[PDB]
Design a protein around this ligand. Structure first.
Ligand SMILES: Nc1ncnc2c1ncn2[C@@H]1O[C@H](COP(=O)(O)OP(=O)(O)OP(=O)(O)O)[C@@H](O)[C@H]1O
Ligand SMILES: Nc1ncnc2c1ncn2[C@@H]1O[C@H](COP(=O)(O)OP(=O)(O)OP(=O)(O)O)[C@@H](O)[C@H]1O
Ligand SMILES: Nc1ncnc2c1ncn2[C@@H]1O[C@H](COP(=O)(O)OP(=O)(O)OP(=O)(O)O)[C@@H](O)[C@H]1O
Ligand SMILES: [Ca+2]
Ligand SMILES: [Ca+2]
Ligand SMILES: [Ca+2]
Ligand SMILES: [Cl-]
Lengths: 99, 99, 99
């Protein structure tokens, strides 16, 4: 049988791995998944800088499944409020069907 | 032109890489993608144990595209029936548009 | 507040990392995320070959968020037209909610 859940993705600088993991757990999520990633973006806020000739930068990608949209929004808000202006970061939400 | 397909995700202990790959292929999927991952969860069933002070554990993330919901459900069922009680594992389904 | 965006995924041979990154950026995307991956598929076109007894092959997974479906389709088209016949490659699109 199915249950509709929300999937929050946070892609951010690899150096924020432990800090963002703590926000997710402190907010009451049941868990999280994290993957190593790389990327480029257009906000140009990376804490360690960017060179003139761009190349892919080191990131992590979190995926957090939540039983309510409310909880996904809360985690997203906390990460963005704390880090979005000072660190490269992008975030999005969608829905999936959990078992 | 587009075709609606289903995307099954399985996130599980890294030690199940070969066993789960075999279920996916034996069920008739056209392929699979797998990524290294880490994570934490709340079922507390990891086959290799967890310590009192939790940290991220080693996982793999599979993504399997299927032409029917029926096939995604079958693969999901087979993995869950065989491994969910004895190994850390979470699974979800959504739809995407293949070319 | 929310904005509906499109998410284009391209999973392809690891050797195409720089060539596909250039298409994404030359098309005007605001960024991209890329992850190391492995997989198997059924088209059997891998540029470096496949053995009789299959095993997972080395890939990369791109995710590209776009503000229009039009731009996702354009990037997808350019990658497919250039590489799909000569290199292992699969691609799909869905929608997500960006902040
Ligand atoms: N359109 C996009 N599609 C997919 N991933 C994106 C996109 N834009 C940004 N990202 C991802 O978010 C990360 C941070 O991008 P951000 O928008 O915060 O701009 P930035 O500070 O310029 O980042 P970077 O230093 O990596 O260029 C990128 O490295 C990438 O992994
Ligand atoms: N809410 C969640 N959101 C995202 N990923 C999750 C979530 N819950 C669990 N996961 C992922 O599934 C994996 C296994 O979690 P499971 O629910 O089976 O509990 P567990 O046995 O307690 O896992 P772990 O030993 O990793 O803590 C986690 O390591 C994580 O990668
Ligand atoms: N049904 C699928 N679900 C998920 N990923 C898939 C699927 N089919 C293919 N892929 C991914 O796309 C990659 C390339 O598959 P493609 O369809 O191009 O066939 P191929 O040339 O036979 O690939 P391979 O040499 O990897 O077997 C695979 O390695 C896999 O990562
Ligand atoms: Ca940048
Ligand atoms: Ca646990
Ligand atoms: Ca093949
Ligand atoms: Cl991923």
């Amino acid at each position: 049988s199915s249950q509709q859940v929300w999937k929050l993705v946070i892609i951010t600088e690899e150096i924020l791995l432990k800090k963002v993991s703590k926000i997710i757990k402190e907010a009451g999520a049941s868990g999280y998944t994290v993957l190593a990633a790389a990327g480029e973006g257009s906000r140009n806020v990376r804490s360690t800088g960017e060179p003139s000739v761009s190349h892919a930068y080191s990131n992590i990608k979190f995926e957090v499944l939540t039983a309510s949209r409310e909880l996904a929004d809360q985690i997203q808000d906390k990460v963005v409020a704390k880090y979005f202006d000072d660190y490269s970061c992008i975030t999005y939400i969608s829905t999936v069907e959990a078992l």
